[PDB]
Design a protein around this ligand. Sequence first.
Ligand SMILES: [Zn+2]
Length: 221
Amino acid sequence: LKAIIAPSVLASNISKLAEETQRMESLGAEWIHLDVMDMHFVPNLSFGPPVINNLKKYTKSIFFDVHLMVEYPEKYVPLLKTSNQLTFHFEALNEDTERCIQLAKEIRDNNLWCGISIKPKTDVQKLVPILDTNLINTVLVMTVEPGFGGQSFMHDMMGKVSFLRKKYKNLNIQVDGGLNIETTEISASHGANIIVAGTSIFNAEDPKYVIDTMRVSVQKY
Ligand SMILES: [Zn+2]
């Protein structure tokens, strides 16, 4: 397990996506978190494969972490072959294990990391059957109602994080929604090792300071 900081571009000046990502890259961010929303799974439309595929032309080593907050996530796999991890929602596939296992198999067969996400009201234990197959590289625990940035961190989601870390020691646990210096420390104390932060990084007075502070706090655990 590694301490990973993944700035969420949704909170940046997206009309300058390439510039913002290169900046995060120059500051040492290991991953770049790309939120794809289709105005159906969530009430917001962000950007899709055409934008992400073009961005890849201007980046270097930064890992492409795509969070698919969309219906029919299976349709996006062939459109994002140059990315690094594709994370789909357990809820997008009607919470049925077999369908999730099949999509995960396909994503892994495209030589991509596979992530699965659950919203605040979804019970973490429902993921066990899928997680036991070892096909999932990352579980993205939403710490806020997905769709928009700027919302407040839900401390009551930490139980999900502890459950996962205790049961799966090598599983990457990602938190997303309201992460800042203080809530990153809280998340890491429960087992999170990948931190998605939007507002706290892109609106920071000293971006690198925030990123480094966050990483060290995760590494401590
Ligand atoms: Zn996300």
